[PDB]
Structure formats: structure tokens, C-alpha cells
Paper text:
Eukaryotic translation initiation requires the recruitment of the large, multiprotein [name] complex to the 40S ribosomal subunit. [name] is a large and structurally complex molecular assembly that, in the majority of eukaryotes, consists of 11–13 subunits ([name]-[name]) with a molecular weight of 600–800 kDa. We present X-ray structures of all major components of the minimal, six-subunit Saccharomyces cerevisiae [name] core. Yeast [name] engages 40S in a clamp-like manner, fully encircling 40S to position key initiation factors on opposite ends of the mRNA channel, providing a platform for the recruitment, assembly, and regulation of the translation initiation machinery.
Many viral internal ribosome entry site ([name])-containing RNA elements require the presence of [name]. Because [name] interactions are also mediated by [name]/[name], we were able to model the interaction by fitting the [name]/[name] heterodimer into the 43S⋅[name] EM density map without any adjustments. This fit of the [name]/[name] heterodimer places two loop elements (between helices 2 and 3 of [name] and helices 1 and 2 of [name]) important for [name] and 43S binding (Sun et al., 2013) in close contact to two extrahelical bulges conserved within domain IIIB of the CSFV and [name] IRESs. Consistent with our model, these RNA elements are protected from RNase digestion when bound by [name] (Sizova et al., 1998; Sun et al., 2013). Using the previously identified positions of the various [name] subunits as a guide (Querol-Audi et al., 2013), we fitted the models to agree with features of the EM density. The proposed arrangement defines the molecular interactions within the core subunits, with the [name]⋅[name], and with the 40S subunit. Remarkably, even the helical bundle structure recently proposed for the 26S proteasome lid (Estrin et al., 2013) fits the remaining density after placement of the [name] and [name] domains, suggesting that it is a conserved feature of the [name]⋅[name] core of these functionally diverse complexes.
Author numbering:
A (entry chain A): 354 to 494, 1000 to 1033
B (entry chain L): 406 to 422, 438 to 515, 1000 to 1023
C (entry chain C): 299 to 636, 1000 to 1024
D (entry chain E): 4 to 93, 121 to 219, 227 to 395, 1000 to 1025
Write the structure that this text describes.
Amino acid sequence: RLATLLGLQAPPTRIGLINDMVRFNVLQYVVPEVKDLYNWLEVEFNPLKLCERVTKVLNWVREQPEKEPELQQYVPQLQNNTILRLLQQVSQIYQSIEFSRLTSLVPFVDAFQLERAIVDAARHCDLQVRIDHTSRTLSFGXXXXXXXXXXXXXXXXXXXXXXXXXXXXXXXXXX
Amino acid sequence: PQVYEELFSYSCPKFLSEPFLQQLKVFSDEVQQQAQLSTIRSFLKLYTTMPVAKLAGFLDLTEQEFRIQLLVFKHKMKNLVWTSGISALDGEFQSXXXXXXXXXXXXXXXXXXXXXXXX
Amino acid sequence: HTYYKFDYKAHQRQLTPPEGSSKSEQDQAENEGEDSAVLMERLCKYIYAKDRTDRIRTCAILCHIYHHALHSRWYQARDLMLMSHLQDNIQHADPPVQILYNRTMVQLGICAFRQGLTKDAHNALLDIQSSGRAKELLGQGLLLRSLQERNQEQEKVERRRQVPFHLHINLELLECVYLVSAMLLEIPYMAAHESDARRRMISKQFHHQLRVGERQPLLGPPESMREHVVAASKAMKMGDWKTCHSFIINEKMNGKVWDLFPEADKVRTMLVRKIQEESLRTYLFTYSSVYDSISMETLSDMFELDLPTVHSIISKMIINEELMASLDQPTQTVVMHRXXXXXXXXXXXXXXXXXXXXXXXXX
Amino acid sequence: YDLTTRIAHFLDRHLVFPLLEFLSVKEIYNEKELLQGKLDLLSDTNMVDFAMDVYKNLYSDDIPHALREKRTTVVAQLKQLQAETEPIVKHGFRQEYLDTLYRYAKFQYECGNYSGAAEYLYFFRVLVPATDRNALSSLWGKLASEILMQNWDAAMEDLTRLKETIDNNSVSSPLQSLQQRTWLIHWSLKGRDNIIDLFLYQPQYLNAIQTMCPHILRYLTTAVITNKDVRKRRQVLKDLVKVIQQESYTYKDPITEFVECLYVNFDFDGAQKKLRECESVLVNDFFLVACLEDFIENARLFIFETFCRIHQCISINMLADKLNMTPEEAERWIVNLIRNARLDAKIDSKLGHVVMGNXXXXXXXXXXXXXXXXXXXXXXXXXX
């Protein structure tokens, strides 16, 4: 009810809210490091380089008296967003990645806290996983079945692409 | 069997009921011997590889002690139950179609439903 | 004028009583190694008789149980209660007995909980803590507020028999205790139900309050004690045991609930351990869906529970709930996520039962 | 454990002396406590045979005065009772004759001549005014004397005569007493599965006479725990863990309480360590002594079965190392257990690997499904 209570026409999404953040006035007075952060996470997010970028960007915030103060109190949710994105992207990149590698790939306060986060992402359905503690591996899906339905899901995507492509070709025909 | 044998022993009178015609109780004894075999087949394998000792414990119950070396091989000859690796140096026994079975079950379910609806 | 106090305060009252008194005296009692215990048990034995009235006899008994439950081991009190045989008698009446009946129940419920018996405590307190009016049922209510009620005074004076504050025990302590119990008991069974294995059904006290909070438009950081307990519960659900332990203090600190016990450190660590166990259980229950396999070493380190406890709890539970889970003790590893064939067999059985029932009606 | 309390704990005279003599004979000849207390206790009574034994070495020094007085007072008492009974047989009153039979029974019992105590005890049969008091008390006596003469057959007999007898009162414990005697007979006669059912059944809340309150807790507890063949999950759960009444007895001996909690909770190592701890005391128990080795072994077998069914493949060496008991000893125990057929454990000691097994597989599930379908069809037919 409260969203209607604040003269908002409807509950917004974070992407929507961000656009106001995107707007220059918020941006103009906005510390630069945050604009960079937004690039690193929202614009061009790449797991193979995100850790480095964050490592070089996080030093600057700490040094600043004011920036650090703003930053100190959002460390937790920010970390959660970044790690959520890393888990999703890893879900896209891998099929069965080692627990050592997956935890290693994304920075965590503790190895066990990283597992906690991964499961939480799974419960909220941002990723489907099966964690085999015996072999220390994680699978982003009996074995042959999981491969069969992964194949089917790939074939489907391929068909969709082909269909779309055909549409584009039609336009080329006129040319 | 011990209970089965005793049941014949006590109700010896029922079997007898002419005496020459049934001098030896032949049919009842034959029937009992078939009856004894069924339970062993009932385990019915389903194990790829089975410890000898477990088999010995179960075959021990049968009256002949040596039957399992013999009783187990004999069962294989009958073909009621299948034994794999029997007589092996190791001494441990090894133990579309599916779709058809499933379809059969589905048919039964439908039949039951039909009778219910018709009822 | 004695029982509700400590052995010290009592012996002060007694000593001071004797200092005033003339040296020459007549006493039935003979001095014993413990002066106080022998006084209480002496008058106790005196009061109870076949001839003696239930209100007086039962009064005596209840006083014994109260004193003993405070200053002596719990088992003795339990034995007294079950041997004394008052069910009908305790409820009515003795005028002040009602307080003893509910007061002594509260007290053994408290001492048993001090002994860190949860299963016992929840057994003890449920009847009396189901009461909405419990504050009144313990005979503690401000005289004034009911003094306007009860008037006229003629009737009123008899009615306002509520026990004195010094005798009275704080409600927050009691409620927090019972809720802490009901938490430890009902959480893993809830979680499993969340798991949907549904081997057994369990009820946890304060469960209704938690449900109300979830449906609340606003969720605030915990302030009232039940909210701290609440946060500890949700923390158990998500598998943070450290958070849960933290929260109880936070709810407790405003409450002062745990500060009202002399042994508080001991119970802090004891509860820390029991919570470690049950939280480990809860974790396992909720997360067995996405985990096919586990590591007892890692789990042991991270729950701060030595493996001997871990393997035991997990194996026990799995065997009790008929969970499709397999443990290799040699490599110390666990397995889940399975059975189909067996399940179908069960369903068939159930169906057969239903059919039989229908036949009954048809007949 | 201290003897003073144990000897003090049991009301029965036979327990009071026979137990001391057992503890003395049972463990160490040398130890003072069994012999000193038995001596002093015997000297409080009319049996010079026991007194004569005490006089003998390993016993308190013989005294001329104690034996002569007992002996003479006995001669006198026997003459007296003999006459009184002569006269009672000749006022023609049943009660007096019954008392005489009872009094000859008492006299013989205290004098330590048990056969006669029994005979004259049951001679009160005919002259019983009523079965319930005259006859049931005769039963209680034959039960005491039979327990002490070590015929538990006869104990069961007079238990069935007593509890078979038509008049029964719910309020009276004697139910309790008879339960205890039966339990004791079963325990003296795989697991019985009767002893525990009996001991667990009720507590009088009054002195056992036959069974120590601790004795009922421990006997019930161990017998139950060892009844794998008979015991239900309820029998572990229903009749012991969930049983509130039995809790009373259990709280008496808390080591046994925790032993059972440990077993029920799957920590069999803890349980078996408790048992190892108590073993020396339990070998001192006059009734329990003979069954100790059996019950503990059975409990161990049950624990192995619980471990053994839950894991398809077992690392035996690791289990022995991680057992909290020696691996070699565990292997030996398993080897002993297996031949009996108690365990279907597939074990090579040398390998240290253990493996137990409970298209073929696929067919199995299919078969079950078909079975259920059959049942359903049957129900349909019945409905029609």
C-alpha cells in the first residue's frame, strides 16, 4: 500500500529506480566511483574481470571521508547483488564446475558463506543447482536424463534463433 | 517346513479319507515339496552380486545342509530363480520391455476407472 | 513467610526471630545438619494427615514442592508431586492454593529448564501457558485496576487474593523460557515439513506469533522479546546459528530475561550447544533438496559440532524419518534426492484401504 | 558402588544375605564387605547353616553362644508349633490350622529349611477360607520360597494360579508384585521378549518385596534394548521411551536412562561404553549375572544392524578406527555374530571392507506396481 501512499503510480523495479539515478542531476553530484561501479555491475559485467575492477575501485571509497561513510552502510546488500550476479553468470558459463573453482571465482567473506549464498540464490530461483559434497562439484542443471533435457533446451534455443534469422533474411531478400 | 510337516502329521486322518486307493498319501507329499520351493524363488534374485554367507544362512533353513551348494544350483536348473557366478572361484553369486510393462499398468488403471464409472 | 525466599534470607529471618526470643523454649523439632531443610520438612510432615484437611495438607505439600524446586534438586520435587497425588484437590481450593498449584508448576518448569531439559519443560508448562489470562492465573495483577472493578468492597476484599510481588515471579522470564523451548522443539519438525518428508508432526510454542509477523505489512528489527526469539527462529531456518544465539541476547537484554537466573553463564553455553544441534538438524532438513552429497568434516567445523555428534544426529534422524539418505562412515559422506517403485507400492496400499472403507458403507 | 546402600536398598532377606554372599563369591573371595555384612546380618536371625558357613573361613569367626541359643530356641519353637498344630487339627477351626501351616512355613523359612517351608506353606491350600486372601497369599509365599530355591517354573505356575484366580482388584499392586515375579521368572528362563514386557508394564509405587526399584529399571531397560527380534520401534519407542510410568523407575538409575537414550539416538559407541562401565557392577547382580554377556552382545548386534542396513558399502577398517572401540575387537565380534545369522554382513577382515545388500531391479519395482494394481482390482470386484 505504501508505494501508492508515496504518490508513486505503481511499485517500481530496481532498474526503473536506477534510471532516475541514471539521470544527470543524481549523476552530476554523484561521486565518480559509483558511476564506475554501475558500469562494472550493471553495464558490462564480466566475471573474469569483475574482481579486479572492484579491487581497484574499493580502495578509493575507503580513503574518502564522505564516500566511505555512504559506502560503509551498504556493503552487505551491494555484496549480495554482486555475488548473485556472479552465481547467475557462472550458471550460464558452466554445467558442472568444481566447488573450489566456483567459490574461488567469486570473492566471499568465507568459503561456507559463499555456499550459503549459492543456495539462497537457488531457493529464490535465480539459479538451479545440485551440489555434490562428495566430489566437491556443483551442477547447474538420472545423469543421462539431465543431459537429455539440457540438450532439448539447447535445441529449442537454436530453433528460436534460426526462426528469428529467417525473418531477417526476408528483409535482405528485398535488398 | 517344520510347521508344514507337522500339519500333515496331525491331520493325517483327513488325507487318508479307499485306504488302498490312497495307501501312501502320494499327492499331498508332492504338493508340499512344490510348496517348500516357492519362498526361495520369492527373493527372486534382483541382486547383481550376492554374498555367499547370506545365501548360506537362508538355505541353511532348508533341511539339507549341503543343499545350497546343491540346493542353490538345483534352483537354477528349475529356472524359477536365476543365479549368476555360481560355482565360481570367487564363490559369490551374481544376479522397450520396461515401456511395455508400464503401458500394461496404465491399462489396468484405466480398466479400474471404467468399472468405477460404469458402476 | 519462608518458602519463596532463599535459604540465606530464611535463615536470617529465623536467626533474627530466635535472637528476640527468650533462651528457654519448647520445640518439638530436633536440630539437624541442615537447619532450614529440616524446618520445612518438619512442618510439612506435621501438616499432612488423614484427619487433616486437604486445604491445609495440600497447602503444606505445595509449599514443600515450591521450596524444594527452588533450593533442591528437581527430581526430588517431581517425585513429591507425583507421590502426593493431588489432581482434583490442587485446583480447589485452599484460597491461596491456586497460586501454589500454578506457582509450583511454574517453578519446576523453571528449574527443569535450568537443568537444560527442554523436552521436560515444554511438557510441564503447556497447560498453564496456554492461558491468555495467565498473569491473573498466577495471582499477580495490580490491585488498583481490579479494585475499581471488584467494588463494592464487601465482595471485593475476598476477591483480591492475588499474591505479593516478592512472591510473584516475572512473566517475561517464564514466557521467554517456554518460547525458547517450543522453538528448539518445533523448528526442526517444521523445517522437515517444509522439506515435506512429513514423517512426524510437531507443535512449537509462539508459532502463531511468528505467522502473524510474516503476514505483517511492516517488519521491524526486533524490539520486544518475542521478536528477538522470532529472529533467532528465522536465523535457525536459514542456518545461521551464530545470528540466532546473538538475537536471543538482544531480545533478552531489553527483556532482562536471562539475567534473572544465577547460573546464566552455564545456561548460555548449554543453550548455545543445544541450539547448535537443533540448528544443524534444521539446516540438513531444509537443504537436502539441492544437495545430493555432504561432508561431515566441513559440517562439523562450521556448526562447531564435533563429528561424533553430527553423524549421530543425522543418522538417528534419517532412520527415524525414513529419509532416503545414505551415509558412508568410512569416507564420512552423505547421499540424498532419490525409491519411486517403493513409493508407488505404498500409494497402492492406501488406495486399497479406501476401497475397503467404501465397501463398509455399501454394506 | 557402595555396598551399604545396595544391601540397604533391597527389602528381601534373601537379597539382603544371598546378594552379599553372591558379591563375595561372585567377584573376590578376599574383599571384606561381602563377608562382614553377611556375617553380621546372618547373626541377626535363626539360620545356623548360613551362620555355620560364616563361621567357616572367609567368614566371621565362629561363636559358641550364637549357635547354641539359636539351635535351642528352635527346638523349643518346633515342639510348641507341633503341639499347637496337633490341637488345631484335633478346635476344628480352619483359620487356626491355616495359621499353623503358615507358622510352620515361617519357622522353617527363617530356620533356612526351604523345602519344608514350601511344603507347609502350600499345605494351607485346603484350609483357605477364601482364594483371594488365603490362597493368593499362599501364592506370594510359594513364590518367595520358589525364587529362593531357584525354580522359576514353579514361580510362573503360582503366578498363573494367582492371576488366574477369579477375584482381582485393580487398586492393589499385588498385580505389581506378580508382574515382578513373572518378569523375574522369564529373565531367569534369543531374547525372551517377555521379561521386558513384564518389567515395563507397571510400578506399584509400593515396595517391590521381590524386585529392587533399581532392579526393575535396569532389568526392564536392558532386556528391552536387547530384544531386536521381538522389539517394535514402539517397543524401543512405545514401551520404553514414550512410557511415562516406567520413567519413574528409570530416573532411579540414570546411567541406564542415558544408556537407552544413547541407543535410541543412534550413538551406539556411547551406549556400549556405558555398558562396558557398568559391566563389573552388573556381574555382581544375583539375577542378572548369568545373562549379562548375552544381553550386551545382542545390543551390539542390534547396533551393527542399524549401521549395517543404512549403508550399502562400509569401510570396515575406518569404522574400527572410528568406532571408539578397537577395530580388531570389532571385527572379531562381527565374525562371531555372523555365523549365528544375526547379521547379513558381507565381511572380509583382511580387506577391511564390508558390503551388505538388502533389469532385475527395474523388474522389482514393476512387480510391486502390478501387485498394487491387483489389490485395487479386487476391491472393485468386491464393490460390484
